Amino acid sequence: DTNQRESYLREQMKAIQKELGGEDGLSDLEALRKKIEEVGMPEAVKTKALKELDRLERMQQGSPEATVARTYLDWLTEVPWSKADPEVLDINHTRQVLDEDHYGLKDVKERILEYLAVRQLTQGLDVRNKAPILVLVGPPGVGKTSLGRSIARSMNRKFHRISLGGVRDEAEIRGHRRTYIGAMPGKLIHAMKQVGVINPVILLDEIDKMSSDWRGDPASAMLEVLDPEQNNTFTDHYLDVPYDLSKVFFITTANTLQTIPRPLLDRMEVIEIPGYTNMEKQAIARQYLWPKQVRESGMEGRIEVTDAAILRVISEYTREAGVRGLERELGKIARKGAKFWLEGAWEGLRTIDASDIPTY
Amino acid sequence: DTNQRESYLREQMKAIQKELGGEDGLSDLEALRKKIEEVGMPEAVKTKALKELDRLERMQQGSPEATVARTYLDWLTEVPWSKADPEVLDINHTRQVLDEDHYGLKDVKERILEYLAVRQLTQGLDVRNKAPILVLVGPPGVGKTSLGRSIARSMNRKFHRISLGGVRDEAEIRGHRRTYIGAMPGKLIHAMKQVGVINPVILLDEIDKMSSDWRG
Amino acid sequence: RLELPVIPLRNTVILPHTTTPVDVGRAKSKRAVEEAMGADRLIFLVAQRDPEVDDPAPDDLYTWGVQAVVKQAMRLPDGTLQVMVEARARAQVTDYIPGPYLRARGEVFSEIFPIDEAVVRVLVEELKEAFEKYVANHKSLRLDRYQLEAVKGTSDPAMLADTIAYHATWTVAEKQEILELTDLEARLKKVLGLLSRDLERFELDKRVAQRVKEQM
Amino acid sequence: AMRLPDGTLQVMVEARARAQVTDYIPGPYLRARGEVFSEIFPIDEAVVRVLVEELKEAFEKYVANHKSLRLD
Ligand SMILES: Nc1ncnc2c1ncn2[C@@H]1O[C@H](COP(=O)(O)OP(=O)(O)OP(O)(O)=S)[C@@H](O)[C@H]1O
């Protein structure tokens, strides 16, 4: 009875197939095979998938190798295959966006609007480009990230970003070959995993801030994803089949010309980003900075500052080149305005002149 | 019909699980199924629990898929869902609380006034932040966590402490997918399973004493 | 009727207009049997709860008492007085008079015939076909053929309704909810829904039965 | 008409026609002005008869859609 009744219990724990509950997953990784089939994948990916799915269903318990194999299966299926985005095939919308939201960027938006125009002149939107991918160089916090977000909004494809600065090896740009629980791909595969389409607008953060010493040089991997003739055959260390990276746009950022590595310095379009002047940041603070401090700290129509006091702030509370320091000062003004308003609203609309600034 | 047929699955397989040769599940798949579909928690819990049914009906001893079904089920259920403490929204209350709990330098008190006075203006038909998160810097000996529990008591919220000087990877704060026990979930969901409401104050201790020892 | 003797029913409520056996094993019910043969063969049958206390209680009864005209009453020397009762209709129980033997007064029959009887006859024919399908399919789960034979050739809709509701096997709470429903169509809708639920768990039994041969 | 024993005036009437109130005489009791009849007789009775038959079929469907919400 101990053998036969337990065998019939095995018959029950498979033969119920969880019924209504089993409808989802179809008995543990039938639905993952279904989702291999559902996602339109390259054929080498599908052969690797079906092969290592046959490496699965092998008594998962007592085998964390089957756990990391199902993990690899998830990455394979979750990675977006044949899922695109609508684009904009005009340069006019990018003109209206970067004339609209970001205060012209003083002249250099047109040097961007030539690059996007040249990119949309390339016929068929073909894989070969032999072309640069628009590096941005400039002192920190000058709108470059929101510049890329704007360019993707004009593109009407979703922006993304990954702070790749400070990484010491290739082992999390390519991942590593699977051997245990906790096996992980590169950061780029994480990035395009949390982007559910196969043609995003990817913005690199700190290529010049990469570090090298041990566990393989990631500069090979950035070079391998760098060239449009090369990123189409970018393969992994976690994954196997080379991934197609032609449709994926790569805006990149940096901070220093002279510490980006030599294979990543050639074939690149250098844009030296400027920093809005005092009065230009005054104009910025008047319409897109202090209004957002007002709109996020919840004080619309309940406070105001004179712009000579904004001159007093920029001349006295922020000597950084960018706007993040001025953003922090205007945040502190927003917070002390919230306190001095929640002390009892003495006015229906406050008045911040240049006098009481070391009181707010 | 789906719920009653799954209840028929509950009834048949609770009659089945009593004599299992798979014993580390302890026949508690249907015992904890009372909060799979007789649950007063949202359709995230319902859909997760429907997949837990697919994660039941499995054996044990070494990497069990059904023990991790019930451990995951408890983790989802024990973690509060749409359960909230009544939090008092007052700032002068905190002026008394920080007067009754500390001697005070009377300087940082103004800073938490700044932040909480912003917190009084949480608008937009919800509570959305886009705001700083109060880094506290200074000696360890100074009553920082005392200040935090003062703020938590001032807000009628459950103070906790999980420290991040002791995490080296995204496996002590991130999880692993529920297919084996011996995967143990992270610190914030540890502290959130500790609390019975979905809204605690959490103070973080010594963020600067963290390192990337292993890959990641 | 009023102040008639009360016999607690054995393990299930006896629905009207079905030839059923009623066991009388306890002496406290035997005294009310001896009283009920002094009431012109008419018994106000009030059922007790599913855990049958050995003596009838003035708090464990049900709120519906059925009046039964005794076709014949045979006595047996084994200790059980099996009585052949053919009941008429449910009636409400106002309150409980303690015994033993128990007494409970009622009123006129709660079965009513409302307007729009064409819909009533359509529902009777639909429920007759659905119960014929339920009886013909449930040969594996032991549904009898005399139960299907005893529901053919009925004059009142209450005849077929209560007889079919007795001839299908489910719990006591659903039968109590049926006897609460004095409407002529709501009882038919309830029986149709319960038959659909039983046929769907029956389908669930064949689903697990296919995956029996699959996964063997 | 007749008088109910509980203190209610019960009257069985059939309405004649619609009218428009021009001026309101103050009350109580209330007074109304208007016309003796302002109804419109059917013209082009083929479409009217088609509409009557369609309304009859739609009302038959409406009363036939009830299963536990019975109507007279
Ligand atoms: N033309 C502009 N130049 C600089 N900052 C701007 C400009 N337009 C808007 N901003 C503000 O810039 C802030 C966010 O961007 P920044 O701090 O300038 O830089 P970032 O894009 O966040 O990071 P970078 O520039 O890539 S290092 C917001 O508060 C915007 O209001």
Numbering used by the authors:
A (entry chain B): 218 to 577
B (entry chain C): 218 to 433
C (entry chain F): 2 to 217
D (entry chain C): 74 to 145
Lines quoted from the article behind this entry:
The Lon protease is a AAA+ protein found in prokaryotes, archaea, and eukaryotic organelles. Lon is involved in cellular protein homeostasis by degrading damaged or misfolded abnormal proteins, which prevents these unwanted protein species from forming toxic aggregates. Lon is known to form a homohexamer; each protomer is composed of multiple domains, including an N-terminal substrate-binding globular domain (NGD), a long-helix domain (LH), a three-helix bundle (3H), a AAA+ ATPase module, and a protease domain.
To study the structure in the substrate-free state with ATPγS, we first set out to identify MtaLon with a point mutation in the N-terminal LH domain to eliminate substrate binding while preserving the native sequence of the AAA+ and the protease domains. Using a fluorescence polarization (FP) assay, we found that MtaLon-Y224S, which carries a mutation of the entry-gate residue Tyr224 to Ser19, does not interact with fluorescein isothiocyanate (FITC)-labeled casein. Unexpectedly, both MtaLon-Y224S:ATPγS and wild-type MtaLon, whether with ADP or lacking nucleotide, predominantly formed left-handed spiral pentamers or spiral hexamers, rather than closed-ring hexamers. The substrate-free hexameric form also adopts a left-handed spiral structure. It is composed of the tethered pentamer and an additional Ac-protomer, Ac6*, which binds next to the protomer Ob1 and occupies the lowermost position of the spiral. Interestingly, the 3H subdomain of Ac6* occupies the axial cavity of the spiral complex and binds to the ATPase domains of the protomers 1–5, effectively blocking the accessibility of the pore loops and forming an inactive structure. In the absence of substrate, the sixth protomer binds to the pentamer, occupying the lowest position of the spiral oligomer, resulting in the formation of an auto-inhibited spiral hexamer.
